Design brief:
The structure is cut from a larger assembly and holds chains A (140 residues), B (95 residues), C (186 residues), D (154 residues) and E (160 residues).
Chain B lengths: L37 E4 L18 E8 L2 E8 L2 E7 L4 E3 L2
Antiparallel strand pairs in B: 1-2, 1-5, 2-3, 3-4
Chain C lengths: L10 H4 L5 H8 L5 E6 L4 E7 L6 E7 L15 H17 L6 E3 L10 H12 L13 H5 L1 H7 L17 H12 L6
Parallel strand pairs in C: 1-4
Antiparallel strand pairs in C: 1-2, 2-3
Helix pairs in contact in C: 3-4, 3-7
Chain D lengths: L1 E5 L8 H9 L7 E5 L3 H10 L3 E4 L3 H11 L11 H7 L5 H9 L14 E2 L21 E2 L2 H10 L2
The chains are: A alpha+beta (140), B mainly beta (95), C alpha+beta (186), D alpha+beta (154), E alpha+beta (160).
The complex binds chloride ion (CL) (2 copies), magnesium ion (9 copies) and sodium ion (6 copies).
The structure holds 3 RNA strands.
Function (chain B): This is one of 5 proteins that mediate the attachment of the 5S rRNA onto the large ribosomal subunit, stabilizing the orientation of adjacent RNA domains.
GO molecular function, one term (chain B): rRNA binding
Family (chain B): Belongs to the eukaryotic ribosomal protein eL21 family.
Chain lengths: 140, 95, 186, 154, 160
RNA sequence: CCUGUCAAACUCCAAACUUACAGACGCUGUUUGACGCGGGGAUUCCGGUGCGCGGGGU
RNA sequence: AGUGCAAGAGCAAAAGAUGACUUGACAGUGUUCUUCCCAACGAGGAACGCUGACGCGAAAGCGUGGUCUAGCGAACCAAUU
RNA sequence: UUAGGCGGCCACAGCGGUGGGGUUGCCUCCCGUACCCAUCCCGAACACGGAAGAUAAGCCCACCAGCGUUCCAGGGAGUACUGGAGUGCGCGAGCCUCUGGGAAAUCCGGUUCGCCGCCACC
């Protein structure tokens, strides 16, 4: 019952929403893998008229690349209760988001016979706080 | 009418009831009819192609051969005989 | 769900099992469909025709009933797929089926994949099916050579149960040879 | 089986209604015909409802009118018991009347004109501007009601 | 302009403001009168003014009749008397006038009217048994300012 | 929540009714040849009124 | 929401978005509907074919320009292939 | 169908919720990147290879009606509207009678938590 219910880290999305780049380099070195350009939608008066064009960059970390990042990333922030999602996620910091979920999440990410994860099987803020707090740090 | 195009006054007949909205099931678009069979003509709002002039909605004609994948249905408009090119998607078997 | 005006998708669309746009295009051929489907452990091939109350399967083959002919290996790989297609194709030939179009459902048209292996199998059985040779895996991989060379990097047997240590693409030949044989109880 | 009598003329009457009366073999005012009670015939009389008098007549009344106004398909010949006997599947007017009422046959099948050309109502009718329930002569009648009219148009 | 020009319902419903511009404002000041903070159920007597013929009542008439009715209730029960009166209809129908002769006759927009079917409640007042004859009087004055003949009907009220 | 109203260019609904085809009855046609085909000759293209349904207009 | 533009209609593993490739916005010739309900009438338009040559796709298949209904022009003469 | 595959009808099937079910069986989640293949970055997905573990998801089985939907009884209602007729009534807008049809809202009580087809399969 528990083994297939205990939380895990699906992805850690590190991103820097600049606005016009040279910052890709630092994300690459701090994460361990290639970055991705970030285009934008809708024209803005703040000299942001160009629709499709570099504005930010991100990196989605999975498995070891994520843990090996968080081991030195988490100690750089003071996690808060409010800083938590309703699905059991949290974003701190250059932004660093951590997507948490249970074992059978593939059911909602696959092509064939996909299905949305029932609320009961969805992670909670509390259940999330516990799992992470239960790994080198403190809550509140 | 204020205009004389094919879609004049077709607001009702070429619109789906909100629940029948969306891509129609393929079964009726691939139905096969034989020469001599009586078929009811009715445009399916969701299927763009294989249509006929909206003025003929409600007609019941006789399949008399085909042209490509479409069918050649014979009807009588008032007193005049006409041949209508139409796909299965807009046809239903009588009875 | 929300009200009288709400539009609920067709059942097989909710279930995310049938691509209706692809299905229509498939049915336009007027030919029977060679339904290639996979499972984590198995591979299924069916020759399906259109019917008044639903589809009609005139012939089929499952990777499980492959053992009935002398298969002692796993059932979710390339050799398994080809043989299941060949078996289904052979049963199709017996039922009077001469031609078919490959239906891969929600699977991806990836070069050298298992659905094309199923396709190659059915074609070799005698079925005329619109295809493209350079999208099929090269013969050796279908035999299961990629798996043997993988076990070559041994240190620990690839297969848990004992089918063999270094594996056998030769077993694939034995089975194909058995199926291509005229006798065989289909 | 109902007895139909046209009481209102063709002038100004709808063409589809006039054509209905003609299909029921009535082409003149005071002309009567006998009609079986079927769904098909029921619709026809309902459509003609406002220019006619109808209802199921009694055995006696039918016999009086048949004797007095029935005619052969062609010719003057009186339709009496002897005529009925020498030309029909029955022995006398009573047998024919009974058969008509029980809808077993028709005037045509027995070589008779489908139309009973009645005489104007002696003492006059109740009026062609109102139905029976309002004191008029139009529409469905009682068996006693139809008999009164048919006998007056003897 | 006489009401003879607009009282009948011989024209299509003309209320779509998305296709009609320049519609004059309504002269009707209020629809809820008396003590609007209280409920209708808090009263033993409920009397309604019923229209006997299907007609169109111009917004100018609704105001004049409502005014002459409520103005009476105010005079007899005070500016804060224990009662509440409601004008339930709103002048939705837009009116035109062809004010060139019959050429390009479609009229310009001149006003609004409320379509009332015979047997409907135009006004409904709620009062105590004491003030029952006062509301009957307000209505008498009210029906003298609208086109149709009316019935003053006592719905909830049997201290009779 | 409660409470007051509407739609020619609104519709979750929804008639009567009109209409395609077919069968049945009726009527009609096979010497009065219908239905239909081909050809000759027109007249006509200022209309009006009642009723029902209308749109404009006091 | 979006889908170039009126209005109404169509569209969600798409008819919309992104990316890539491509030139079928192809030549020839028809069937049919429309224009003109019924019911004759041209240009124009559309639907659906075939022949030829191509594009893309694993393939079924899609592409006779734009999701559909507006965006059009005789004879004589000239230029052009 | 002791969990499968392809479907037809396309909410009676939706939304939401409760309970139950898997030693070499089935579907899954699951484990894992040498290969075919793959991510404008990530074996996440797609693809390939595989069983140490699990029934918690999904799925299948049994069930609940609060919302949405389908149909049915009673009430609303033979009301609203309406095809045919009238030397019936009304100053008139309009109404009435006879004849043939006949709603909608809503209330109340039931129904509905899919049905059916082909194939495969302790
Ligand atoms: Cl057409
Ligand atoms: Cl599959
Ligand atoms: Mg309309
Ligand atoms: Mg004679
Ligand atoms: Mg006299
Ligand atoms: Mg008289
Ligand atoms: Mg009409
Ligand atoms: Mg197009
Ligand atoms: Mg000139
Ligand atoms: Mg030139
Ligand atoms: Mg469970
Ligand atoms: Na549809
Ligand atoms: Na002028
Ligand atoms: Na008055
Ligand atoms: Na033309
Ligand atoms: Na880019
Ligand atoms: Na489970």
């Amino acid at each position: 019952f528990h083994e297939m219910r205990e939380p895990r880290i699906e992805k850690v999305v590190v991103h820097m929403g600049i606005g016009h780049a040279n910052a890709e380099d630092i994300l690459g070195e701090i994460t361990g893998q290639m970055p991705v350009r970030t285009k934008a939608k809708r024209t803005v008066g703040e000299f942001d008229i160009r629709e499709g064009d570099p504005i930010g960059a991100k990196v989605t970390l999975r498995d070891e690349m994520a843990e090996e990042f968080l081991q030195t990333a988490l100690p750089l922030a003071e996690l808060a209760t409010s800083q938590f999602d309703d699905t059991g996620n949290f974003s701190f910091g250059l932004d660093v988001t951590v997507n948490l979920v249970r074992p059978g999440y593939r059911v909602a990410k696959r092509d064939k016979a996909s299905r949305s994860i029932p609320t009961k099987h969805r992670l909670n803020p509390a259940d999330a706080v516990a799992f992470i707090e239960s790994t080198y740090d403190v809550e509140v | 009418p204020s205009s004389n195009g094919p879609l004049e006054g077709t607001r009702g007949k070429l619109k789906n009831k909100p629940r029948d909205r969306g891509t129609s099931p393929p079964q009726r678009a691939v139905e096969e009819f034989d020469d001599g069979e009586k078929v009811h003509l009715k445009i399916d709002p969701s299927v763009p192609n294989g249509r006929f002039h909206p003025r003929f909605d409600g007609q019941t004609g006789t399949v008399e051969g085909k042209q490509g994948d479409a069918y050649k249905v014979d009807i009588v408009d008032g007193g005049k005989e006409k041949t209508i090119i139409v796909t299965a998607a807009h046809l239903r078997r009588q009875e | 769900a929300t009200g009288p005006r709400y539009k609920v998708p067709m059942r097989r669309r909710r279930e995310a099992r049938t691509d209706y746009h692809q299905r229509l295009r498939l049915l336009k051929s007027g030919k029977p469909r060679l339904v290639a489907r996979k499972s984590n452990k198995h591979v299924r091939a069916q020759l399906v025709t259109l019917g008044p109350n639903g589809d009609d399967t005139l012939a089929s083959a499952h990777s499980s009933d492959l053992a009935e002919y002398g298969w002692e290996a796993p059932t979710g790989n390339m050799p398994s797929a080809y043989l299941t297609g060949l078996l289904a194709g052979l049963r199709a030939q017996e039922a009077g089926v001469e031609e078919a179009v490959l239906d891969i459902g929600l699977n991806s048209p990836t070069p050298g994949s298992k659905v094309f292996a199923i396709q190659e199998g059915a074609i070799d059985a005698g079925l005329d099916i619109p295809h493209n040779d350079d999208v099929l895996a090269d013969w050796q991989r279908t035999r299961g050579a990629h798996i043997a060379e993988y076990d070559e990097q041994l240190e620990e047997p690839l297969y848990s149960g004992d089918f063999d240590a270094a594996d056998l693409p030769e077993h694939f030949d034995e089975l194909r040879e058995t199926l291509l044989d005229g006798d065989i109880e289909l | 089986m109902h007895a139909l009598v046209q009481l209102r003329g063709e002038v100004n009457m709808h063409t589809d209604i006039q054509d209905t009366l003609e299909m029921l073999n009535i082409h003149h005012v005071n002309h009567c015909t006998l009609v079986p009670e079927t769904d098909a015939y029921r619709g026809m009389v309902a459509k003609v409802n406002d220019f006619v008098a109808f209802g199921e007549p009694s055995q006696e009344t039918l016999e009086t009118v048949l004797a007095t106004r029935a005619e052969p398909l062609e010719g003057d010949a009186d339709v009496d018991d002897e005529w009925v006997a020498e030309h029909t599947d029955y022995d006398d007017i009573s047998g024919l009347a009974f058969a008509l009422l029980s809808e077993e046959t028709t005037l045509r099948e027995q070589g008779l004109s489908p139309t009973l050309r009645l005489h104007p109502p002696r003492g006059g009718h109740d009026g062609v501007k109102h139905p029976v329930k309002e004191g008029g002569q139009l529409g469905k009648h009682d068996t006693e009601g139809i008999d009164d009219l048919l006998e007056a148009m003897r | 302009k006489p009401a003879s020009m607009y009282r009948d319902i011989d024209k299509p419903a003309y209320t779509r403001r998305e296709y009609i511009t320049g519609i004059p404002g309504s002269k009707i000041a209020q629809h809820k009168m008396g003590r609007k903070q209280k409920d209708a159920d808090d009263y033993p007597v409920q009397i309604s003014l019923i229209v006997e013929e299907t007609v169109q009542l111009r917004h100018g008439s609704l105001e004049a009749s409502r005014l002459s009715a409520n103005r009476h209730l105010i005079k007899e029960l005070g500016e804060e008397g224990d009662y509440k009166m409601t004008l339930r209809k709103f002048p939705h129908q837009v009116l035109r006038e062809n004010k060139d002769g019959m050429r390009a006759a479609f009229g310009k927009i001149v006003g609004t009217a409320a379509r009332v079917q015979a047997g409907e409640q135009l006004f409904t007042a709620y009062c105590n048994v004491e003030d029952a004859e006062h509301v009957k009087e307000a209505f008498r004055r009210a029906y003298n300012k609208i086109t149709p003949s009316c019935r003053i009907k006592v719905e909830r009220g049997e201290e009779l």
